[PDB]
Scaffold this active site. Structure first.
Site, PDB file in Angstrom:
ATOM      1  N   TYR A   1      12.408  23.502  33.777  1.00  0.00           N
ATOM      2  CA  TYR A   1      13.442  22.451  33.645  1.00  0.00           C
ATOM      3  C   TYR A   1      13.889  22.040  35.046  1.00  0.00           C
ATOM      4  CZ  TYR A   1      17.952  20.234  32.635  1.00  0.00           C
ATOM      5  OH  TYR A   1      19.009  19.374  32.578  1.00  0.00           O
TER       6      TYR A   1
ATOM      7  N   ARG B   1      27.449  27.499  38.307  1.00  0.00           N
ATOM      8  CA  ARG B   1      28.868  27.214  38.446  1.00  0.00           C
ATOM      9  C   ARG B   1      29.409  26.392  37.281  1.00  0.00           C
ATOM     10  NH1 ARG B   1      31.602  23.765  42.125  1.00  0.00           N
ATOM     11  NH2 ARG B   1      29.881  22.301  41.726  1.00  0.00           N
TER      12      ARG B   1
ATOM     13  N   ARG C   1      25.620  22.100  26.051  1.00  0.00           N
ATOM     14  CA  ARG C   1      24.469  22.176  26.940  1.00  0.00           C
ATOM     15  C   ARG C   1      24.330  23.621  27.406  1.00  0.00           C
ATOM     16  NH1 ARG C   1      23.431  17.743  30.984  1.00  0.00           N
ATOM     17  NH2 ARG C   1      24.920  18.833  32.346  1.00  0.00           N
TER      18      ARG C   1
ATOM     19  N   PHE D   1      20.925  15.627  56.007  1.00  0.00           N
ATOM     20  CA  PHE D   1      20.863  15.292  54.589  1.00  0.00           C
ATOM     21  C   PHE D   1      20.372  16.490  53.781  1.00  0.00           C
ATOM     22  CE2 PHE D   1      17.945  14.014  51.168  1.00  0.00           C
ATOM     23  CZ  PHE D   1      18.722  13.212  50.366  1.00  0.00           C
TER      24      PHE D   1
END
Length: 350
Positions: free
Chosen positions: A145, A192, A202, A262
């Protein structure tokens, strides 16, 4: 001179991404618009996938074909439920189409390929969910996933970085690096967010882990089981920490500062969030986040060089190492993975 299409794309970045809008906007101009387009395309894909008002018969072809829609001038879509938060991105998607087609061909191929691979993964998932359980049962399914989401984002970003020569080509021939980069972020979010994700039906934690601690997943949230809940989250943290060294290998291949920033900022935020969640019972009652003063320090420590970032990583590996307690059934493995991280950083940077 900024076009209105560009302005729209940047606007939607601000409205759809609290976090990434800031880093993306600092990017070197060679990749500023390409990564902005990449983000909005995946965001559009996700706005379709999340909307349970779109029936599978309509939704599944949209997800599989979305890569082809990027070539259709003026493409729009108004079929989201009227309350879907990001619906207007799809309503006004023609700005993304325009800026997608304005990209260098090498960038268009990367973005379209990832849109294709991810759209189809998402479609396969939405399908399974409609007919089967689709519950994460094994660690293998958990990692898959994460690969079809964060892993493919990392793949695409890496291919953009290498194409623009902002990253060492070797980053492409060792795909576990960008995978670990992506899975470190997504797994930290999954850890978290477990409570709020559970209150939206979910569930991403693999049963192969949590069934060693509770009988039913919902038992994790009852105060009676707080101790075994902490042990469960501990193994989840352990599983995420196994990516951390490879995240550092990856950052060491980056050759341009805005790209480094980034990539480094979310990784530092992730390990700090993992250290806050480790052995923390609040994680099961609400959504916790690191303090403002900590986040400020981390932004400065992530926007310099690899040495400073690795020192930050070593600092949070040591904190986790110290919280680790022998009553935890994951005690030995937590301390071994923390030791590996610290010793590796000591080797690179004594």
């Amino acid at each position: 001179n900024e076009t209105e299409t560009q302005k729209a794309c940047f606007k939607f970045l601000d409205l759809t991404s609290r976090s990434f809008s800031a880093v993306i906007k600092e990017l070197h101009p060679e990749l500023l618009l390409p990564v902005c387009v990449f983000y909005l395309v995946l965001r559009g894909l996700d706005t379709i996938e999340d909307d349970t008002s779109i029936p599978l018969k309509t939704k599944e072809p949209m997800l599989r074909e979305f890569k082809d829609y990027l070539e259709q001038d003026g493409w729009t879509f108004d079929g989201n439920r009227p309350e879907e938060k990001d619906r207007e991105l799809l309503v006004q998607f023609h700005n993304v189409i325009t800026e997608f087609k304005n990209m260098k061909p090498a960038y268009r191929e990367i973005v379209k390929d990832i849109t294709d691979k991810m759209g189809n993964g998402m479609a396969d998932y939405c399908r399974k969910a409609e007919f089967e359980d689709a519950s994460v049962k094994t660690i293998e399914e958990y990692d898959l996933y994460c690969y079809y989401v964060a892993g493919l984002v990392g793949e695409g970003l890496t291919r953009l970085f290498v194409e623009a020569e902002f990253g060492n080509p070797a980053l492409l021939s060792r795909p576990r690096l960008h995978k670990s980069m992506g899975l470190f972020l997504q797994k930290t979010n999954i850890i978290r967010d477990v409570r709020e994700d559970h209150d939206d039906d979910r569930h991403f934690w693999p049963k192969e882990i949590w069934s060693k601690y509770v009988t039913e997943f919902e038992d994790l949230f009852k105060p009676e089981n707080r101790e075994t809940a902490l042990n469960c989250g501990s193994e989840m943290v352990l599983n995420a920490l196994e990516h951390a060294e490879e995240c550092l290998f990856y950052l060491a291949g980056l050759r341009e500062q805005s790209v480094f920033n980034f990539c480094a900022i979310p990784q530092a935020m992730a390990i700090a969030t993992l250290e806050l969640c480790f052995r923390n019972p609040d994680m099961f009652d609400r959504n916790i986040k690191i303090t403002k003063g900590e986040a400020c320090q981390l932004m400065m420590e992530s926007t310099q060089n690899l040495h400073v970032l690795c020192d930050t990583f070593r600092r949070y590996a040591r904190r986790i190492h110290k919280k680790n307690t022998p009553k935890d059934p994951n005690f030995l493995k937590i301390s071994i993975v923390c030791g590996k991280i610290e010793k590796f950083i000591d080797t690179i940077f004594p």
